[PDB]
Amino acid sequence: HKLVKNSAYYSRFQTKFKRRRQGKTDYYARKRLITQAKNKYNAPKYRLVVRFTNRDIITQMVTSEINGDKIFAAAYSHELRAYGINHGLTNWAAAYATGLLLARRVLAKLGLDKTFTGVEEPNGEYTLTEAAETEDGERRPFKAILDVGLARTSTGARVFGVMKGASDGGIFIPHSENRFPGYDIETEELDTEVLKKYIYGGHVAEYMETLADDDEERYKSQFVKYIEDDVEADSLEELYAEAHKQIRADPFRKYVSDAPKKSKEEWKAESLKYKKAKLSREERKARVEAKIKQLLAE
Amino acid sequence: IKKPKTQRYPSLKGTDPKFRRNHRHALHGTAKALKE
Amino acid sequence: LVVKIANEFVSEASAAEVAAAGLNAIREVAMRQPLCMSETLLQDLVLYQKSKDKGVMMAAKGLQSLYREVYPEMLQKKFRGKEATMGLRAGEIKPLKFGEEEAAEDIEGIELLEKYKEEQKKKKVEQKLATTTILTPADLAKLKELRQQAKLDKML
């Protein structure tokens, strides 16, 4: 007969933050991510926010201000259809391509696009961008810190695929090789060939080969759009290489999303048409009087 | 109780040693800059 | 005997004084012979240090400390402490066994004494011991001092 949820409990209840009640922000990690040394003053601390959705990847340059965060640059996985990748936009190779695209976009916006060019041919080796031989002198590489959010940082996660994409694009992201999908904990040596296979999406290719050999029905159920648009297991490496070359060529391509298209005012008018509105004070008082009449009848 | 007097240029004693080390070299550099 | 003392003396219905007396007796028996325990029983008895009674707390902490010097493997990783975990990680601490006696082929600190003699010889040049060299009493005192210094370094 205990009533835990009473008026005293509701009055003494102290809510969490809104983005923690929604379960979207880890403020304990976010504090360490956004604090800058006070002797460094107004030096921005750029972070690569990476988030993974069921059908998309969201990769951003984020800076922190006292009243909000600013997006310096942003690249999404669905924009790779303009570069060629129109299948598997949430896999490890698409994560790498999105990270490379974001790195090229932020370097082009900063203007260091020609001074800092990363590794142009992906090899799968643990490398970090260093100081470039500028004619003026030594230019330190542009630095950003990875922010994975609430993702479990296990070995083989695509949060490190986007990391490797930015590191190959030219951003100095401090990182270690032990969470790449070729690392062995016992040996403590990274497998460059397996990492390159994940770069060019060869794990998906050998998956379709294995499925086509053993279980044709499951292959047709899962990889149906690959069959429909006639992309094979052997063509994935060339497709991703051409996509990387096109990304390094034109980082600011525009993609038509094939969704219904209107203007901001037209979408505003449509959303106001499909919008139930709150009752006025007079209407609320009228329904309160109706409830009072019902109570008097009762 | 009168307020104590203050110095226009306070002594850099409790300041961060790294900033003090850089600041003294900056003072020497601007010193030869003024001597030039 | 230890199981009977644990059941009759250290139980949920037992008084605090009865539990403290039983744990003290168990600690005495464990000092005299440590192999009487089971690991689960010892961890259960060490968990009585969280008791609100001071006597039960100090008796359980005495039992835990005794097994820290004697046999830290039965103790939980939370309860081992610093030196026990470092010794178990490095491998110096060995399991205690019934009937096991020391079988040191060389004297304790003889390696340190030989190292000190080699350092003195190297200093003289710049300016096996048990088999051939006669054990001087000054050399034995120096070896004891070196063993004490090595024990202090291992403790640090």
Partner: protein, 168 residues
């Protein structure tokens, strides 16, 4: 109400054997659970010392195994065949789960090994609806709605429809 993602399904089936004593009896009970489920069972220690039960803290006194998928349906069907497809109405919880208990594990179809012995079991079937990942996931964890929560009556009707059982 008839929406095909409101259909009831078995979230899990948990098999429990609380021996009350450690050693060979618990080892053979774990052997029974392992050969039944196909998975390695997990042991459960006592959390406080009870003198009248002959148990103490940290001493292992129980064993259990959680099985999901069609294997859970098969094991539940065998247990219900032992229980002659008949349950008493108290066995259904207010949260939509149910459970029962058998006294001999040889009624499940397991052979009698004389070294192993005879042990009884507790079967607990936890039900769910599609959309429990909302309450089980790490990022954006939320609560299941009242219209989506399973009711004791719905569990009883689902049992009577699928397993043609008699709840009385």
């Amino acid at each position: 109400a008839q929406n095909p993602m409101r259909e009831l399904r078995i979230q899990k089936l948990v098999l429990n054997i609380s021996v009350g004593e450690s050693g060979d009896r618990l080892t053979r009970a774990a052997k029974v659970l392992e050969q039944l489920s196909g998975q390695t069972p997990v042991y459960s220690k006592a959390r406080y010392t009870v003198r009248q039960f002959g148990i103490r803290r940290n001493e292992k006194i129980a064993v259990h195994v959680t099985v999901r998928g069609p294997k859970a349906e098969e094991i539940l069907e065998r247990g219900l065949k032992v229980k002659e497809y008949e349950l008493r109405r108290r066995n259904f919880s207010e949260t939509g789960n149910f459970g029962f208990g058998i006294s001999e594990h040889i009624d499940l179809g397991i052979k009698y090994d004389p070294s192993i012995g005879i042990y009884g079991m507790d079967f607990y079937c936890c039900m769910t609806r599609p959309g429990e990942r909302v309450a089980k996931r790490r990022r954006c964890k939320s609560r299941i709605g009242a219209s989506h929560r399973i009711t004791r009556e719905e569990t009883i009707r689902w049992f009577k429809q699928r397993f043609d059982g008699i709840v009385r």
